């Protein structure tokens, strides 16, 4: 399973961020750490002058209801796009 290996994943993304990553990809590992911890989005709407906020508020709310293993399972498959050198 890739739900327990999430540890080595969060440490690779939290410590290493110089890897070739996109602007939308960096928002994936962010919504996973929240869904794999809480479960769903339940925060008030962000500012009204920022764009990224919407992407960070819509994403976390998009996977609203996701399970713990469900998110962690995505952190391993998604992280592969940022730094696949962690699995191999």
PDB file of N, CA and C in Angstrom:
ATOM      1  N   UNK A   1       0.827  -1.201   0.000  1.00  0.00           N
ATOM      2  CA  UNK A   1       0.000   0.000   0.000  1.00  0.00           C
ATOM      3  C   UNK A   1       0.865   1.256   0.000  1.00  0.00           C
ATOM      4  N   UNK A   2       0.323   2.343  -0.541  1.00  0.00           N
ATOM      5  CA  UNK A   2       1.049   3.606  -0.607  1.00  0.00           C
ATOM      6  C   UNK A   2       0.491   4.604   0.404  1.00  0.00           C
ATOM      7  N   UNK A   3      -0.215   4.092   1.406  1.00  0.00           N
ATOM      8  CA  UNK A   3      -0.801   4.937   2.439  1.00  0.00           C
ATOM      9  C   UNK A   3       0.135   5.069   3.636  1.00  0.00           C
ATOM     10  N   UNK A   4       1.030   4.099   3.791  1.00  0.00           N
ATOM     11  CA  UNK A   4       1.983   4.108   4.895  1.00  0.00           C
ATOM     12  C   UNK A   4       3.301   4.749   4.471  1.00  0.00           C
ATOM     13  N   UNK A   5       3.603   4.668   3.180  1.00  0.00           N
ATOM     14  CA  UNK A   5       4.832   5.241   2.646  1.00  0.00           C
ATOM     15  C   UNK A   5       4.703   6.753   2.484  1.00  0.00           C
ATOM     16  N   UNK A   6       3.505   7.269   2.738  1.00  0.00           N
ATOM     17  CA  UNK A   6       3.248   8.700   2.618  1.00  0.00           C
ATOM     18  C   UNK A   6       4.265   9.503   3.424  1.00  0.00           C
ATOM     19  N   UNK A   7       4.760   8.907   4.503  1.00  0.00           N
ATOM     20  CA  UNK A   7       5.739   9.566   5.359  1.00  0.00           C
ATOM     21  C   UNK A   7       6.940  10.042   4.547  1.00  0.00           C
ATOM     22  N   UNK A   8       7.572   9.113   3.836  1.00  0.00           N
ATOM     23  CA  UNK A   8       8.731   9.438   3.016  1.00  0.00           C
ATOM     24  C   UNK A   8       8.360  10.407   1.898  1.00  0.00           C
ATOM     25  N   UNK A   9       7.064  10.529   1.632  1.00  0.00           N
ATOM     26  CA  UNK A   9       6.579  11.424   0.589  1.00  0.00           C
ATOM     27  C   UNK A   9       6.491  12.859   1.095  1.00  0.00           C
ATOM     28  N   UNK A  10       5.853  13.039   2.248  1.00  0.00           N
ATOM     29  CA  UNK A  10       5.700  14.362   2.840  1.00  0.00           C
ATOM     30  C   UNK A  10       7.053  14.957   3.212  1.00  0.00           C
ATOM     31  N   UNK A  11       7.990  14.093   3.587  1.00  0.00           N
ATOM     32  CA  UNK A  11       9.328  14.532   3.968  1.00  0.00           C
ATOM     33  C   UNK A  11      10.128  14.964   2.743  1.00  0.00           C
ATOM     34  N   UNK A  12       9.798  14.385   1.593  1.00  0.00           N
ATOM     35  CA  UNK A  12      10.486  14.710   0.350  1.00  0.00           C
ATOM     36  C   UNK A  12       9.930  15.991  -0.263  1.00  0.00           C
ATOM     37  N   UNK A  13       8.673  16.291   0.047  1.00  0.00           N
ATOM     38  CA  UNK A  13       8.022  17.488  -0.470  1.00  0.00           C
ATOM     39  C   UNK A  13       8.152  18.651   0.507  1.00  0.00           C
ATOM     40  N   UNK A  14       8.232  18.327   1.794  1.00  0.00           N
ATOM     41  CA  UNK A  14       8.357  19.345   2.832  1.00  0.00           C
ATOM     42  C   UNK A  14       9.805  19.809   2.966  1.00  0.00           C
ATOM     43  N   UNK A  15      10.738  18.902   2.696  1.00  0.00           N
ATOM     44  CA  UNK A  15      12.159  19.218   2.787  1.00  0.00           C
ATOM     45  C   UNK A  15      12.716  19.617   1.424  1.00  0.00           C
ATOM     46  N   UNK A  16      12.344  18.863   0.395  1.00  0.00           N
ATOM     47  CA  UNK A  16      12.805  19.138  -0.960  1.00  0.00           C
ATOM     48  C   UNK A  16      11.685  19.721  -1.815  1.00  0.00           C
ATOM     49  N   UNK A  17      11.893  20.939  -2.302  1.00  0.00           N
ATOM     50  CA  UNK A  17      10.901  21.610  -3.135  1.00  0.00           C
ATOM     51  C   UNK A  17      11.552  22.262  -4.349  1.00  0.00           C
ATOM     52  N   UNK A  18      12.838  21.990  -4.543  1.00  0.00           N
ATOM     53  CA  UNK A  18      13.577  22.550  -5.667  1.00  0.00           C
ATOM     54  C   UNK A  18      13.352  21.733  -6.935  1.00  0.00           C
ATOM     55  N   UNK A  19      12.740  20.564  -6.779  1.00  0.00           N
ATOM     56  CA  UNK A  19      12.465  19.690  -7.913  1.00  0.00           C
ATOM     57  C   UNK A  19      11.535  20.371  -8.912  1.00  0.00           C
ATOM     58  N   UNK A  20      11.638  19.975 -10.176  1.00  0.00           N
ATOM     59  CA  UNK A  20      10.805  20.548 -11.226  1.00  0.00           C
ATOM     60  C   UNK A  20       9.327  20.294 -10.949  1.00  0.00           C
ATOM     61  N   UNK A  21       8.655  21.294 -10.386  1.00  0.00           N
ATOM     62  CA  UNK A  21       7.237  21.178 -10.071  1.00  0.00           C
ATOM     63  C   UNK A  21       6.438  22.309 -10.712  1.00  0.00           C
ATOM     64  N   UNK A  22       5.200  22.010 -11.091  1.00  0.00           N
ATOM     65  CA  UNK A  22       4.335  23.000 -11.721  1.00  0.00           C
ATOM     66  C   UNK A  22       3.652  23.872 -10.670  1.00  0.00           C
ATOM     67  N   UNK A  23       2.714  24.700 -11.117  1.00  0.00           N
ATOM     68  CA  UNK A  23       1.986  25.588 -10.216  1.00  0.00           C
ATOM     69  C   UNK A  23       0.714  24.919  -9.705  1.00  0.00           C
ATOM     70  N   UNK A  24       0.199  23.970 -10.478  1.00  0.00           N
ATOM     71  CA  UNK A  24      -1.014  23.253 -10.103  1.00  0.00           C
ATOM     72  C   UNK A  24      -0.676  21.967  -9.355  1.00  0.00           C
ATOM     73  N   UNK A  25       0.525  21.450  -9.590  1.00  0.00           N
ATOM     74  CA  UNK A  25       0.971  20.224  -8.939  1.00  0.00           C
ATOM     75  C   UNK A  25       1.262  20.468  -7.461  1.00  0.00           C
ATOM     76  N   UNK A  26       1.833  21.629  -7.160  1.00  0.00           N
ATOM     77  CA  UNK A  26       2.162  21.986  -5.786  1.00  0.00           C
ATOM     78  C   UNK A  26       0.899  22.155  -4.948  1.00  0.00           C
ATOM     79  N   UNK A  27      -0.243  22.247  -5.622  1.00  0.00           N
ATOM     80  CA  UNK A  27      -1.523  22.410  -4.940  1.00  0.00           C
ATOM     81  C   UNK A  27      -2.176  21.057  -4.680  1.00  0.00           C
ATOM     82  N   UNK A  28      -1.609  20.009  -5.267  1.00  0.00           N
ATOM     83  CA  UNK A  28      -2.136  18.659  -5.097  1.00  0.00           C
ATOM     84  C   UNK A  28      -1.681  18.060  -3.771  1.00  0.00           C
ATOM     85  N   UNK A  29      -0.380  18.131  -3.512  1.00  0.00           N
ATOM     86  CA  UNK A  29       0.184  17.593  -2.279  1.00  0.00           C
ATOM     87  C   UNK A  29      -0.287  18.396  -1.069  1.00  0.00           C
ATOM     88  N   UNK A  30      -0.869  19.561  -1.331  1.00  0.00           N
ATOM     89  CA  UNK A  30      -1.361  20.425  -0.265  1.00  0.00           C
ATOM     90  C   UNK A  30      -2.759  20.003   0.177  1.00  0.00           C
ATOM     91  N   UNK A  31      -3.577  19.589  -0.785  1.00  0.00           N
ATOM     92  CA  UNK A  31      -4.939  19.156  -0.498  1.00  0.00           C
ATOM     93  C   UNK A  31      -4.953  17.736   0.058  1.00  0.00           C
ATOM     94  N   UNK A  32      -3.889  16.988  -0.215  1.00  0.00           N
ATOM     95  CA  UNK A  32      -3.778  15.613   0.256  1.00  0.00           C
ATOM     96  C   UNK A  32      -3.444  15.573   1.744  1.00  0.00           C
ATOM     97  N   UNK A  33      -2.506  16.418   2.156  1.00  0.00           N
ATOM     98  CA  UNK A  33      -2.091  16.480   3.552  1.00  0.00           C
ATOM     99  C   UNK A  33      -3.247  16.919   4.446  1.00  0.00           C
ATOM    100  N   UNK A  34      -4.195  17.644   3.861  1.00  0.00           N
ATOM    101  CA  UNK A  34      -5.355  18.127   4.600  1.00  0.00           C
ATOM    102  C   UNK A  34      -6.445  17.062   4.656  1.00  0.00           C
ATOM    103  N   UNK A  35      -6.664  16.386   3.533  1.00  0.00           N
ATOM    104  CA  UNK A  35      -7.679  15.342   3.455  1.00  0.00           C
ATOM    105  C   UNK A  35      -7.237  14.096   4.215  1.00  0.00           C
ATOM    106  N   UNK A  36      -5.931  13.848   4.228  1.00  0.00           N
ATOM    107  CA  UNK A  36      -5.379  12.690   4.921  1.00  0.00           C
ATOM    108  C   UNK A  36      -5.229  12.964   6.414  1.00  0.00           C
ATOM    109  N   UNK A  37      -5.611  14.166   6.832  1.00  0.00           N
ATOM    110  CA  UNK A  37      -5.517  14.554   8.234  1.00  0.00           C
ATOM    111  C   UNK A  37      -6.893  14.861   8.812  1.00  0.00           C
ATOM    112  N   UNK A  38      -7.629  15.741   8.142  1.00  0.00           N
ATOM    113  CA  UNK A  38      -8.964  16.121   8.589  1.00  0.00           C
ATOM    114  C   UNK A  38     -10.032  15.264   7.917  1.00  0.00           C
ATOM    115  N   UNK A  39     -10.128  15.376   6.596  1.00  0.00           N
ATOM    116  CA  UNK A  39     -11.110  14.605   5.856  1.00  0.00           C
ATOM    117  C   UNK A  39     -11.799  15.424   4.783  1.00  0.00           C
ATOM    118  N   UNK A  40     -12.200  16.641   5.135  1.00  0.00           N
ATOM    119  CA  UNK A  40     -12.876  17.526   4.193  1.00  0.00           C
ATOM    120  C   UNK A  40     -12.614  18.988   4.538  1.00  0.00           C
ATOM    121  N   UNK A  41     -12.883  19.873   3.584  1.00  0.00           N
ATOM    122  CA  UNK A  41     -12.674  21.302   3.787  1.00  0.00           C
ATOM    123  C   UNK A  41     -13.818  21.911   4.590  1.00  0.00           C
ATOM    124  N   UNK A  42     -13.473  22.761   5.551  1.00  0.00           N
ATOM    125  CA  UNK A  42     -14.472  23.409   6.393  1.00  0.00           C
ATOM    126  C   UNK A  42     -13.975  24.769   6.878  1.00  0.00           C
ATOM    127  N   UNK A  43     -13.333  25.511   5.983  1.00  0.00           N
ATOM    128  CA  UNK A  43     -12.809  26.831   6.317  1.00  0.00           C
ATOM    129  C   UNK A  43     -13.539  27.920   5.538  1.00  0.00           C
ATOM    130  N   UNK A  44     -13.520  29.147   6.076  1.00  0.00           N
ATOM    131  CA  UNK A  44     -14.174  30.299   5.446  1.00  0.00           C
ATOM    132  C   UNK A  44     -13.466  30.740   4.169  1.00  0.00           C
ATOM    133  N   UNK A  45     -14.223  31.334   3.253  1.00  0.00           N
ATOM    134  CA  UNK A  45     -13.669  31.804   1.990  1.00  0.00           C
ATOM    135  C   UNK A  45     -12.483  32.734   2.228  1.00  0.00           C
ATOM    136  N   UNK A  46     -11.410  32.538   1.447  1.00  0.00           N
ATOM    137  CA  UNK A  46     -10.194  33.349   1.555  1.00  0.00           C
ATOM    138  C   UNK A  46     -10.408  34.779   1.070  1.00  0.00           C
ATOM    139  N   UNK A  47      -9.308  35.489   0.832  1.00  0.00           N
ATOM    140  CA  UNK A  47      -9.398  36.860   0.367  1.00  0.00           C
ATOM    141  C   UNK A  47     -10.208  36.989  -0.909  1.00  0.00           C
ATOM    142  N   UNK A  48     -10.285  38.205  -1.439  1.00  0.00           N
ATOM    143  CA  UNK A  48     -11.035  38.459  -2.664  1.00  0.00           C
ATOM    144  C   UNK A  48     -10.162  39.157  -3.701  1.00  0.00           C
ATOM    145  N   UNK A  49      -8.854  39.146  -3.471  1.00  0.00           N
ATOM    146  CA  UNK A  49      -7.910  39.779  -4.387  1.00  0.00           C
ATOM    147  C   UNK A  49      -6.840  38.790  -4.835  1.00  0.00           C
ATOM    148  N   UNK A  50      -6.903  37.574  -4.300  1.00  0.00           N
ATOM    149  CA  UNK A  50      -5.940  36.537  -4.646  1.00  0.00           C
ATOM    150  C   UNK A  50      -6.587  35.460  -5.511  1.00  0.00           C
ATOM    151  N   UNK A  51      -5.816  34.919  -6.449  1.00  0.00           N
ATOM    152  CA  UNK A  51      -6.314  33.878  -7.341  1.00  0.00           C
ATOM    153  C   UNK A  51      -5.985  32.491  -6.800  1.00  0.00           C
ATOM    154  N   UNK A  52      -4.722  32.285  -6.442  1.00  0.00           N
ATOM    155  CA  UNK A  52      -4.278  31.004  -5.907  1.00  0.00           C
ATOM    156  C   UNK A  52      -5.205  30.529  -4.792  1.00  0.00           C
ATOM    157  N   UNK A  53      -5.600  31.455  -3.923  1.00  0.00           N
ATOM    158  CA  UNK A  53      -6.486  31.130  -2.811  1.00  0.00           C
ATOM    159  C   UNK A  53      -7.683  30.315  -3.290  1.00  0.00           C
ATOM    160  N   UNK A  54      -8.277  30.743  -4.400  1.00  0.00           N
ATOM    161  CA  UNK A  54      -9.431  30.054  -4.964  1.00  0.00           C
ATOM    162  C   UNK A  54      -9.083  28.612  -5.325  1.00  0.00           C
ATOM    163  N   UNK A  55      -7.891  28.418  -5.875  1.00  0.00           N
ATOM    164  CA  UNK A  55      -7.438  27.089  -6.268  1.00  0.00           C
ATOM    165  C   UNK A  55      -7.163  26.223  -5.042  1.00  0.00           C
ATOM    166  N   UNK A  56      -6.734  26.863  -3.959  1.00  0.00           N
ATOM    167  CA  UNK A  56      -6.436  26.155  -2.720  1.00  0.00           C
ATOM    168  C   UNK A  56      -7.706  25.922  -1.908  1.00  0.00           C
ATOM    169  N   UNK A  57      -8.722  26.739  -2.160  1.00  0.00           N
ATOM    170  CA  UNK A  57      -9.992  26.620  -1.452  1.00  0.00           C
ATOM    171  C   UNK A  57     -10.949  25.701  -2.203  1.00  0.00           C
ATOM    172  N   UNK A  58     -10.825  25.677  -3.526  1.00  0.00           N
ATOM    173  CA  UNK A  58     -11.681  24.839  -4.359  1.00  0.00           C
ATOM    174  C   UNK A  58     -11.194  23.393  -4.356  1.00  0.00           C
ATOM    175  N   UNK A  59      -9.876  23.218  -4.365  1.00  0.00           N
ATOM    176  CA  UNK A  59      -9.283  21.886  -4.363  1.00  0.00           C
ATOM    177  C   UNK A  59      -9.600  21.146  -3.068  1.00  0.00           C
ATOM    178  N   UNK A  60      -9.268  21.767  -1.941  1.00  0.00           N
ATOM    179  CA  UNK A  60      -9.518  21.165  -0.636  1.00  0.00           C
ATOM    180  C   UNK A  60     -10.999  20.858  -0.452  1.00  0.00           C
ATOM    181  N   UNK A  61     -11.849  21.646  -1.105  1.00  0.00           N
ATOM    182  CA  UNK A  61     -13.291  21.458  -1.012  1.00  0.00           C
ATOM    183  C   UNK A  61     -13.780  20.469  -2.067  1.00  0.00           C
ATOM    184  N   UNK A  62     -12.947  20.227  -3.074  1.00  0.00           N
ATOM    185  CA  UNK A  62     -13.293  19.301  -4.145  1.00  0.00           C
ATOM    186  C   UNK A  62     -13.238  17.856  -3.661  1.00  0.00           C
ATOM    187  N   UNK A  63     -12.277  17.565  -2.792  1.00  0.00           N
ATOM    188  CA  UNK A  63     -12.117  16.219  -2.252  1.00  0.00           C
ATOM    189  C   UNK A  63     -12.791  16.094  -0.890  1.00  0.00           C
ATOM    190  N   UNK A  64     -13.740  16.986  -0.621  1.00  0.00           N
ATOM    191  CA  UNK A  64     -14.461  16.975   0.645  1.00  0.00           C
ATOM    192  C   UNK A  64     -15.127  15.622   0.881  1.00  0.00           C
ATOM    193  N   UNK A  65     -14.730  14.952   1.958  1.00  0.00           N
ATOM    194  CA  UNK A  65     -15.297  13.654   2.276  1.00  0.00           C
ATOM    195  C   UNK A  65     -14.305  12.526   2.084  1.00  0.00           C
ATOM    196  N   UNK A  66     -13.211  12.813   1.387  1.00  0.00           N
ATOM    197  CA  UNK A  66     -12.181  11.812   1.133  1.00  0.00           C
ATOM    198  C   UNK A  66     -11.711  11.173   2.437  1.00  0.00           C
ATOM    199  N   UNK A  67     -11.210   9.947   2.343  1.00  0.00           N
ATOM    200  CA  UNK A  67     -10.729   9.225   3.515  1.00  0.00           C
ATOM    201  C   UNK A  67      -9.255   9.525   3.771  1.00  0.00           C
ATOM    202  N   UNK A  68      -8.715   8.939   4.836  1.00  0.00           N
ATOM    203  CA  UNK A  68      -7.317   9.144   5.193  1.00  0.00           C
ATOM    204  C   UNK A  68      -6.390   8.412   4.229  1.00  0.00           C
ATOM    205  N   UNK A  69      -6.706   7.150   3.955  1.00  0.00           N
ATOM    206  CA  UNK A  69      -5.899   6.342   3.047  1.00  0.00           C
ATOM    207  C   UNK A  69      -6.072   6.807   1.604  1.00  0.00           C
ATOM    208  N   UNK A  70      -7.233   7.383   1.310  1.00  0.00           N
ATOM    209  CA  UNK A  70      -7.527   7.868  -0.034  1.00  0.00           C
ATOM    210  C   UNK A  70      -6.574   8.992  -0.426  1.00  0.00           C
ATOM    211  N   UNK A  71      -6.374   9.936   0.487  1.00  0.00           N
ATOM    212  CA  UNK A  71      -5.483  11.063   0.239  1.00  0.00           C
ATOM    213  C   UNK A  71      -4.029  10.611   0.174  1.00  0.00           C
ATOM    214  N   UNK A  72      -3.598   9.870   1.189  1.00  0.00           N
ATOM    215  CA  UNK A  72      -2.229   9.373   1.248  1.00  0.00           C
ATOM    216  C   UNK A  72      -1.889   8.567  -0.003  1.00  0.00           C
ATOM    217  N   UNK A  73      -2.896   7.907  -0.568  1.00  0.00           N
ATOM    218  CA  UNK A  73      -2.701   7.100  -1.768  1.00  0.00           C
ATOM    219  C   UNK A  73      -2.434   7.987  -2.981  1.00  0.00           C
ATOM    220  N   UNK A  74      -2.868   9.240  -2.898  1.00  0.00           N
ATOM    221  CA  UNK A  74      -2.675  10.189  -3.988  1.00  0.00           C
ATOM    222  C   UNK A  74      -1.348  10.926  -3.845  1.00  0.00           C
ATOM    223  N   UNK A  75      -0.855  11.015  -2.615  1.00  0.00           N
ATOM    224  CA  UNK A  75       0.405  11.696  -2.344  1.00  0.00           C
ATOM    225  C   UNK A  75       1.582  10.908  -2.907  1.00  0.00           C
ATOM    226  N   UNK A  76       1.379   9.609  -3.101  1.00  0.00           N
ATOM    227  CA  UNK A  76       2.423   8.742  -3.635  1.00  0.00           C
ATOM    228  C   UNK A  76       2.380   8.705  -5.158  1.00  0.00           C
ATOM    229  N   UNK A  77       1.172   8.746  -5.712  1.00  0.00           N
ATOM    230  CA  UNK A  77       0.992   8.720  -7.158  1.00  0.00           C
ATOM    231  C   UNK A  77       1.207  10.105  -7.759  1.00  0.00           C
ATOM    232  N   UNK A  78       0.881  11.136  -6.988  1.00  0.00           N
ATOM    233  CA  UNK A  78       1.041  12.513  -7.444  1.00  0.00           C
ATOM    234  C   UNK A  78       2.491  12.966  -7.310  1.00  0.00           C
ATOM    235  N   UNK A  79       3.084  12.700  -6.153  1.00  0.00           N
ATOM    236  CA  UNK A  79       4.470  13.078  -5.897  1.00  0.00           C
ATOM    237  C   UNK A  79       5.387  12.558  -7.000  1.00  0.00           C
ATOM    238  N   UNK A  80       4.953  11.500  -7.674  1.00  0.00           N
ATOM    239  CA  UNK A  80       5.733  10.907  -8.755  1.00  0.00           C
ATOM    240  C   UNK A  80       5.960  11.916  -9.876  1.00  0.00           C
ATOM    241  N   UNK A  81       5.058  12.887  -9.984  1.00  0.00           N
ATOM    242  CA  UNK A  81       5.158  13.912 -11.015  1.00  0.00           C
ATOM    243  C   UNK A  81       6.131  15.012 -10.605  1.00  0.00           C
ATOM    244  N   UNK A  82       6.302  15.187  -9.299  1.00  0.00           N
ATOM    245  CA  UNK A  82       7.207  16.204  -8.776  1.00  0.00           C
ATOM    246  C   UNK A  82       8.618  15.647  -8.614  1.00  0.00           C
ATOM    247  N   UNK A  83       8.738  14.563  -7.856  1.00  0.00           N
ATOM    248  CA  UNK A  83      10.031  13.931  -7.626  1.00  0.00           C
ATOM    249  C   UNK A  83       9.898  12.413  -7.573  1.00  0.00           C
ATOM    250  N   UNK A  84       9.844  11.781  -8.754  1.00  0.00           N
ATOM    251  CA  UNK A  84       9.717  10.324  -8.868  1.00  0.00           C
ATOM    252  C   UNK A  84      10.980   9.596  -8.424  1.00  0.00           C
ATOM    253  N   UNK A  85      12.026  10.361  -8.128  1.00  0.00           N
ATOM    254  CA  UNK A  85      13.295   9.787  -7.695  1.00  0.00           C
ATOM    255  C   UNK A  85      13.204   9.294  -6.254  1.00  0.00           C
ATOM    256  N   UNK A  86      12.064   9.543  -5.622  1.00  0.00           N
ATOM    257  CA  UNK A  86      11.849   9.125  -4.241  1.00  0.00           C
ATOM    258  C   UNK A  86      11.395   7.671  -4.176  1.00  0.00           C
ATOM    259  N   UNK A  87      10.726   7.217  -5.232  1.00  0.00           N
ATOM    260  CA  UNK A  87      10.236   5.846  -5.293  1.00  0.00           C
ATOM    261  C   UNK A  87      11.292   4.918  -5.886  1.00  0.00           C
ATOM    262  N   UNK A  88      12.202   5.488  -6.669  1.00  0.00           N
ATOM    263  CA  UNK A  88      13.264   4.712  -7.298  1.00  0.00           C
ATOM    264  C   UNK A  88      14.626   5.348  -7.043  1.00  0.00           C
TER     265      UNK A  88
END
